Design an enzyme around this catalytic site. Structure first.
Site, PDB file in Angstrom:
ATOM      1  N   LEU A  41     -48.158 -12.414  -6.118  1.00  0.00           N
ATOM      2  CA  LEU A  41     -47.084 -12.699  -7.119  1.00  0.00           C
ATOM      3  C   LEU A  41     -45.696 -12.806  -6.474  1.00  0.00           C
ATOM      4  CD1 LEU A  41     -48.261 -10.229  -9.943  1.00  0.00           C
ATOM      5  CD2 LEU A  41     -48.499 -12.759  -9.916  1.00  0.00           C
ATOM      6  N   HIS A  43     -43.157 -11.562  -2.619  1.00  0.00           N
ATOM      7  CA  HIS A  43     -43.009 -10.855  -1.356  1.00  0.00           C
ATOM      8  C   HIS A  43     -41.563 -10.817  -0.941  1.00  0.00           C
ATOM      9  CE1 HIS A  43     -42.381 -14.460   1.223  1.00  0.00           C
ATOM     10  NE2 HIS A  43     -42.907 -15.022   0.152  1.00  0.00           N
ATOM     11  N   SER A  45     -38.712  -8.270   1.948  1.00  0.00           N
ATOM     12  CA  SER A  45     -38.569  -7.237   2.987  1.00  0.00           C
ATOM     13  C   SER A  45     -39.292  -5.934   2.652  1.00  0.00           C
ATOM     14  CB  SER A  45     -37.087  -6.949   3.214  1.00  0.00           C
ATOM     15  OG  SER A  45     -36.409  -8.148   3.543  1.00  0.00           O
ATOM     16  N   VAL A  49     -46.317  -8.051  -3.614  1.00  0.00           N
ATOM     17  CA  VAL A  49     -46.891  -7.718  -4.919  1.00  0.00           C
ATOM     18  C   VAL A  49     -48.092  -8.623  -5.204  1.00  0.00           C
ATOM     19  CG1 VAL A  49     -46.557  -7.399  -7.407  1.00  0.00           C
ATOM     20  CG2 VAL A  49     -44.589  -7.151  -5.783  1.00  0.00           C
ATOM     21  N   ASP A 158     -29.759  -1.747 -11.063  1.00  0.00           N
ATOM     22  CA  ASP A 158     -30.078  -3.090 -10.528  1.00  0.00           C
ATOM     23  C   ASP A 158     -30.643  -4.020 -11.604  1.00  0.00           C
ATOM     24  OD1 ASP A 158     -30.104  -5.023  -8.436  1.00  0.00           O
ATOM     25  OD2 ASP A 158     -32.058  -4.363  -7.671  1.00  0.00           O
TER      26      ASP A 158
END
EC number: 2.7.11.1
Length: 281
Positions: A41, A43, A45, A49, A158
């Site tokens: 789904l 990626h 650093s 997922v 965030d």
């Protein structure tokens, strides 16, 4: 050393991992043995997922795995804190649910309910500003999630389109609790950051400001600046007409309340949810 172990701060379940398909005497990881991987789904650093099917129940989940073994104890603690933060939040219909977490070989795995695309992805697929009908729904759901966090003295830190996930029938859920703080640490994306954070003034109001810019971006198909004059203007109550002239007066009014530069004067999530425009449709 690093043997497979459940991670939970409310320490309810057994530390021992078990599943149909898993035998700890074979060399493959618990993740390899206990899930069918369907696709990646995302990626970055942080790691990757995956969309998976669980061998335990035959249902679909997302599993996030860290990139490389823990650098040391402070790295381990920072990563495990996401699990703790998830547990502090607790179950809520507008928050991404954690099913389980474990560590093995210095890698952390978080298994969450499978949601739809991120709001970011949804806007990329649409290729234009979202219809206001859709926007009101997503604003209400994300406000409901923030009200839940804020009532517990928690700040997400965030909020952005990448961390909000669609569900059926026009709903969404807030996720990615890795930066969450309990009032009484790490920085969120600078594009969405509340102006008072420059003076170290952490509070629940910071998330309201971040959601204001999130909604501005999706409703107007507007790329947010990471600095310079444009970054400052959005934190001085300015709305650029080239992007915002098309908003209804009602949606514009709600955005002005959320983008208030002084956090003492900014609307709370509960106050916004009480307005007739944002009540259950």
């Amino acid at each position: 050393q690093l043997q497979p172990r459940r991670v939970s701060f409310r320490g309810e379940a057994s530390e021992t991992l078990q599943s149909p398909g898993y035998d700890p005497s074979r060399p493959e990881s618990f993740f390899q043995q206990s899930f069918q991987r369907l696709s990646r789904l995302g990626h970055g650093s942080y790691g990757e997922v995956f969309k998976v099917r669980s061998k335990e129940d035959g249902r679909l989940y997302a599993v996030k795995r860290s990139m490389s073994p823990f650098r040391g104890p402070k790295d381990r603690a920072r990563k495990l804190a996401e699990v703790g933060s998830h547990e502090k939040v607790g179950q809520h219909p507008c928050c991404v649910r954690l099913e389980q977490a474990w560590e093995e070989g210095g890698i952390l795995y978080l298994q969450t309910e499978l949601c739809g695309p991120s709001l970011q992805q949804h806007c990329e697929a649409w290729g234009a500003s979202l219809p206001e009908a859709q926007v009101w729904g997503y604003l209400r759901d994300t406000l409901l999630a923030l009200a839940h966090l804020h009532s517990q003295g928690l700040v997400h830190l965030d909020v952005k389109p990448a961390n909000i996930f669609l569900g059926p029938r026009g709903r969404c859920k807030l996720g990615d609790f890795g930066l969450l703080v309990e009032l009484g640490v790490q920085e969120g994306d600078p594009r969405y950051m509340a102006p008072e954070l420059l003076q170290g003034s952490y509070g629940t109001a910071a998330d309201v400001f971040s959601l204001g810019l999130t909604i501005l971006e999706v409703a107007c198909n507007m790329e947010l600046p990471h600095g310079g004059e444009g970054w400052q203007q959005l934190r001085q109550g300015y709305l650029p007409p080239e992007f915002t002239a098309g908003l209804s007066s009602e949606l514009r009014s709600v955005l002005v309340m959320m983008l208030e530069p002084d956090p003492k004067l900014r609307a709370t999530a509960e106050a916004l949810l009480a307005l007739p425009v944002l009540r259950q449709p």
